[PDB]
Design a protein that fits this description.
The chain has one domain. It starts with 22 loop residues before the first strand and ends with a strand. The protein is built from 5 helices and 4 strands. It is globular and about 45 Å long. The chain has helices at 34-49, 67-87, 110-115, 127-130, 135-145, and strands at 23-24, 54-59, 95-99, 147-153. It has 154 residues and is α+β, with helices and mostly antiparallel strands. Bound molecules: sodium ion. Sodium ion binds next to loops. The PDB classes it as protein binding. Keywords: Peptidoglycan binding protein Type IX secretion system Porphyromonas gingivalis, protein binding. It forms a monomeric assembly. Structure of the PorE C-terminal domain, a protein of T9SS from Porphyromonas gingivalis.
Length: 154
Amino acid sequence: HHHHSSGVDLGTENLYFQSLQNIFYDFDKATLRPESMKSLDELIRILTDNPDIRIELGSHADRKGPDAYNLGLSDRRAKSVVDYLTSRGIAADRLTWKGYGKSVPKTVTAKIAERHDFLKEGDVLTEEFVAPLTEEQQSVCDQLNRRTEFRVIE
Ligand code: NA
């Protein structure tokens, strides 16, 4: 099969790539911002250039509001991405998705840590981590949790 031990995955959770970005959302919205459409066009290029690969997506919500509500919101966030891709010709069978609600806070990557003096690589944006922060710091963290993650798979 593969003639080597596992290498680095092309995904948004562990590493930062200019050409494979997280999708971020407004508070209580599943809408694709103009920036999100550019990011999805970059993903469509990867899908069309590599016709056999699939994309696994995971959609999320920030700590505010009930668990069940946030699960539904995360499903709508995944669906908006799937609908944009399928509207551009991507076969639905090439995409898998899961809505995690607010159950999986994001881990701060080296790029996120470079951009914010208060965040360090490896910090997990849990409710307990975000709770004692300033209103501005909470807004940065909550925004980072309102995202869709991607991973390129077979
Ligand atoms: Na930092």
